[PDB]
Amino acid sequence: MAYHSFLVEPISCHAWNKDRTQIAICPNNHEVHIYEKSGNKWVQVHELKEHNGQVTGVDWAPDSNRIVTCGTDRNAYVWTLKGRTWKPTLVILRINRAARCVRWAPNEKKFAVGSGSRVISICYFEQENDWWVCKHIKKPIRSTVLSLDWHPNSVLLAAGSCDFKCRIFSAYIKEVEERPAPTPWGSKMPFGELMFESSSSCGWVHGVCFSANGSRVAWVSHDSTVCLADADKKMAVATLASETLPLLAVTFITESSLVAAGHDCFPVLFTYDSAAGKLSFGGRLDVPKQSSQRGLTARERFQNLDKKASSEGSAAAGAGLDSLHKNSVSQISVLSGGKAKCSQFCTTGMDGGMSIWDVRSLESALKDLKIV
Amino acid sequence: MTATLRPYLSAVRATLQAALCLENFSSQVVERHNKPEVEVRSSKELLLQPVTISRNEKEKVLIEGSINSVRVSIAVKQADEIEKILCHKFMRFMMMRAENFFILRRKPVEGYDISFLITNFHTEQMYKHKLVDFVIHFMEEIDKEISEMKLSVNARARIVAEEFLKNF
Amino acid sequence: MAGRLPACVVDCGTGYTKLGYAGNTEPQFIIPSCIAIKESAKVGDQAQRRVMKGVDDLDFFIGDEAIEKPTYATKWPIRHGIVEDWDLMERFMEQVIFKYLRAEPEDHYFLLTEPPLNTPENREYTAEIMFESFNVPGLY
Amino acid sequence: MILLEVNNRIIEETLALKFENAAAGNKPEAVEVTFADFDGVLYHISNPNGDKTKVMVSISLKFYKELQAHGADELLKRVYGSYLVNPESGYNVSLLYDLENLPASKDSIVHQAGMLKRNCFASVFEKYFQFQEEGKEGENRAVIHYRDDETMYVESKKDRVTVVFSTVFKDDDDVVIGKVFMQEFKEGRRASHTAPQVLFSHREPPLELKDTDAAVGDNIGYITFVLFPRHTNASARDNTINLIHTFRDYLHYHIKCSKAYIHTRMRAKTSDFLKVLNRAR
Amino acid sequence: TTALVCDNGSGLVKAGFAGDDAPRAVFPSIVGRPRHQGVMVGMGQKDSYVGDEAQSKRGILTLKYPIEHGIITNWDDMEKIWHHTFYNELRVAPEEHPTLLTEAPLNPKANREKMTQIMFETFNVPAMYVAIQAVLSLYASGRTTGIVLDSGDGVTHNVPIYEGYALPHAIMRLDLAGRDLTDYLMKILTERGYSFVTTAEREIVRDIKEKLCYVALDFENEMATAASSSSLEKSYELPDGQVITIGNERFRCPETLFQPSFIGMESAGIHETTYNSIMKCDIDIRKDLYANNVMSGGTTMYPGIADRMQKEITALAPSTMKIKIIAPPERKYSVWIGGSILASLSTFQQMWITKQEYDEAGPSIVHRKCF
Amino acid sequence: GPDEGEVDSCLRQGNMTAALQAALKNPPINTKSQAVKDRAGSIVLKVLISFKANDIEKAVQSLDKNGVDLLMKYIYKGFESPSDNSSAVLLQWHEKALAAGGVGSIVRVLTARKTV
């Protein structure tokens, strides 16, 4: 539908209040300002610096307005809007070097973590610490986390790892929780325990996503496998890999269809039923925000006496990609109507612009799944 | 035209489409200061395959890839001293100008004739696929320039009596 | 100690060069580091490229007498932001040695001079030249 | 510009200054000299006889032993034995310009005395001239080893005066020129419509002296040089001797002059690729 | 896949591969280089514009086709054009594929070394041999035996063959080409009163001529006719919007083949000059030869010349025997196609010098103490 | 591992499509010995050098996606080894294999844990 870069930030991540208004960002280096949806304009709203480890992910609990901040320092905190600014409120961990990603136990109980230090620093709040504290899954794990997904019952967890082996786990903490419901994958559910695995060490698992209720789960590696486990097919599994350029992201948008995106910058559809290994695509989804009438012959002349990239090609219509797809696209999300009835969706890029998109033109089908 | 060069470099650019991978991570057990990752590769499953690719029988490429940084090296049919040492008056001349373009694995590496050091930084620095659509093919054009120096140098052979005797 | 002939000094000054000969007691010479070439830029007619064949197309003179030369711009391979014409400094010194001094650098030995703040590349590319062009037996 | 003289820039100007000084009666400063030229020279100069009013040039070469064997001495006893002189030790011979050896017209000798190098060569070349003029084959060849990774001799025949050569090739990048461009001399003179015989020979010295195809299919230049009397007249002669007393030595210097030069093209070229390299953007 | 077959000669280049139906690599065997101060200096142009680009720019350029002691002498200007072939026509290396080269009769000594020096040290071919172009024509005809004319843009030759055994004393090589015509032809513009007449218009002269010229049917009838008519005069556009209307010259100057004598030149006229081949030939065959008269070239595509030269020749000849004169459609273009198709008789290769022979002695393996 | 006599039977019988499906049969993936792998690579490369350009696409269309992926592992296996201009015939094979598999067949060779 629509786009603009009000200023050209390398938007390395994005996050919000649940009304998708105040855009927080991972910036260049260690320098954040939050901007906001000024109608559809974008205008500065905050300056943040005191999580000094650049930025990585966050988990902005978006109702309660609690950005658990992460990155290359243990000055990692719930940033909360203190009315004045988003400002730190410390977490204690036993990770080292960094935190890449962080993840509320969905009922906001606590969060899960991905360390610069092989580990899940399972972190839990203490009023007594005035802050969080942690305990550690240094083993039976071997290496650390890039992506995270709690199963909806919120004490049950999935992750994508630099330990590769596509494993399902439990991480209950006695001093904040009680152990979860008999998980069909595996139901030994204390701290640090392993429910199930798919033998896939097949690339470092890079995206993890439950279906609309998590009855099945998808995965992808950055080595660009695309994969699943389904419990009701009796702990069944599936795997595939794409044709196209290597993955930035994937999400379910139902229990049977998913959106994927890679270094091709355009999104592509995926589709499925319940035929175990029958992973299937659905083709490219977007249409460009450009048309062929672009040009300015005077500057084309001036800078054909000078010669910087001065032999033309439609690669340049996407600053090298074509499709207006730039130096690169950098993220995707649904705006509204959700993983069932989406009304709008959006994407970020190295260009620093908001973009929002043509959804319901593709609404043109009914029902899913087949027990195969 | 040498038309299987089209299969050749279309398949290069199909590899450089399958595997335009290079993107960053810093640390998880050892320090954040991103390395010559292709040199310092400890272990396989995180990374791209090590590879080599003949054009014929003397000619081939090496490519080797950490998930974030890459080698290339490329091999040529030519083998006379009159092919080599003469163009190596240039490949001497070349290497300080590598310091003016920053991605050579700056030597005329044997078994091949050259090598390259490539990294994710570049993916964030300016542009997209016009880059590799330049690079991979520019790399042929700088070979076609050997034909340019060829008649040049052979005409320096045509300097010879064309001075000394032709003085009279 | 010698090749066939012993060492000598040139002090390679960034105004004037200075030198003398084996057995003397002075610099016999302290002299303009200068050379004159037409750079009046009307690059025209009968065109040709990519062919280093026998020439009718060079117009150049070196040393103190090159200061008199008209349209010939008497440049100076002294070091003064101009540095790059270490390219010409070879051909220049080849004149000096073989044609002003009228000497033989593969038979003598040598000592030559540099500033403290010197970078490597400009010397070291000339080292192939020192030992393949000038092919000296020894120098520093 | 690339030219030379047989008298030396270094010497003539300094000693004509010493003789401007001798005319003035001026007092010394400490000169001594040794250096080299083409043909393997050890030049020398000095304050000889210790005192305030003498200069001496001297010279030494190994193959003087092959040369004093020949009657070079008599022309030189004219041109330079006009002056009053004696050999120094370690040198073959020396010129004492005692400042009391200087004439009224002090300039007039300076050029001649400086040009002496080639003129000593010419003082013996005249014998092969005289052998050709007397109608004589094979006469009294001057086999000299001026060089030795090389060879030469001077000889005579009734029609034509002669020299012959050898020189060992070091690199094939040289040979690929050697066995080509002189065959566009030995078959190419229309635009240079003068030359005597010169036969560069990638393998072949002539037959009274060595014998032909004495190299590795191309790896030794047995060059040869033979004169039509449109040279062996008392004139066209001299021009040509001058070239020859430098030729291949001077040439193999010009090689490097031209080696250097290509880097103009290469500067341009390599700079061009530095331009071209941007265009990935 | 391939082995390399070319009209490497005069006129246009007219090359292709072995076995093709047509030459295809085609542009003038002449090239130009800017005659100018490049006043927009740094406008990104290389120092030459080549045949078709030479023509696209011919007001800009100096050009070469050297002394009539050959067709050319600094053949090392086709130096450039070797690359203009290899890349700018082809994008390939000769060094890959067995090569069919060609050269003329009677080339003075140095040719074949000086050539092969390049052809193997530089063009590095696997192996090669060099042809003479006459019978290439008969291959296309499917013949071996008769009299073959060449007149072209390099040269002329007149060639009796008998399944081989071609006559060293009655084959007649000659310097002549359409190349030469224009020096008389263009002096006429001051008769035309044109105060405006240059070097570069020679190509338009040649144009108008190639568009509208013919050789006069019985020239004094034509001269009386030009003295009494101007339907002769035919119109021709010129590049600013002009036309010129001209056309008695259009067959007047087309007499010079019978009259080299026009420049005071002591040469006989064409067929009379040519007859001497036959006069030196065997006498017995001169019956049978009436059916064996093979004629071709770009220079051969004019009107009126055919019947003229027949009757002209007939002024030399007896009657007595059955004529066939033999000059095909596209005879001008044809020769490369016959020589292309030879390579199908793979036997044609076996003659080949390889680069080894050329290396080992040198091309002293094959040059010109060799016959 | 593949069978030499089985492949030569199809190859000599003009069953080039069967020679291909046979030469791809039972790959040495599980063997850590490189020698047994290089025997299979020589079997396959002998078939690949033996084909006709026109016949390649008929044979490639007979393979399933796993056969095309395995074939890419073998084409890669070929390409490590310059000789006889093998890489030229291999480039023509690749063009068909790429047309059949798509670029995901390249990706999957670049992901493999063990291989031919």
Numbering used by the authors:
A (entry chain c): 1 to 372
B (entry chain f): 1 to 168
C (entry chain a): 1 to 140
D (entry chain d): 1 to 281
E (entry chain p): 5 to 375
F (entry chain g): 36 to 151
Excerpt from the publication:
Spontaneous actin filament polymerization is a kinetically unfavorable process and nucleation factors are required to overcome this rate-limiting step in actin filament assembly. The heptameric 224 kDa Arp2/3 complex, consisting of the two actin-related proteins 2 and 3 (Arp2 and Arp3), and five additional subunits ArpC1-5, generates branched actin networks by inducing the formation of so-called actin filament Arp2/3 complex branch junctions on preexisting actin filaments. The Arp2/3 complex plays a role in both physiological and pathological processes, such as lamellipodial protrusion, vesicle trafficking, and also the motility of various pathogens. Details on the conformation of the Arp2/3 complex within the branch, and its interaction with the mother and daughter filament were largely derived from fitting high-resolution x-ray crystallography models of the inactive complex into low-resolution in vitro electron microscopy (EM) and electron tomography (ET) reconstructions, as well as molecular dynamics (MD) simulations. These studies led to the model that upon activation, the Arp2 and Arp3 subunits reposition into a short-pitch conformation resembling an actin filament-like state, providing the basis for further actin polymerization.
Here we report, using cryo-ET and STA on lamellipodia of fibroblast cells, a 9 Å structure of the actin filament Arp2/3 complex branch junction. In order to further optimize conditions for image processing, we used established extraction and fixation protocols involving the actin-stabilizing toxin phalloidin to remove the plasma membrane, while stabilizing actin filaments, allowing for a better visualization of actin filaments and bound complexes. Overall, our model reveals the conformation of in total 18 protein subunits (the heptameric Arp2/3 complex and 11 actin filament subunits); however, the resolution of our structure did not allow deriving unambiguous side chain information. The biggest change upon branch junction formation was the actin-like heterodimer arrangement of Arp2 and Arp3, which resembles the first two subunits of the daughter filament. Specifically, in the branch junction, we observe a significant movement of ArpC3 toward the D-loop of Arp2 providing additional stabilization to the active conformation. To derive a more accurate description of interaction interfaces between the Arp2/3 complex and the mother actin filament in our model, we probed for C-alpha atoms of Arp2/3 complex subunits and actin filament subunits being in vicinity closer than 10 Å.
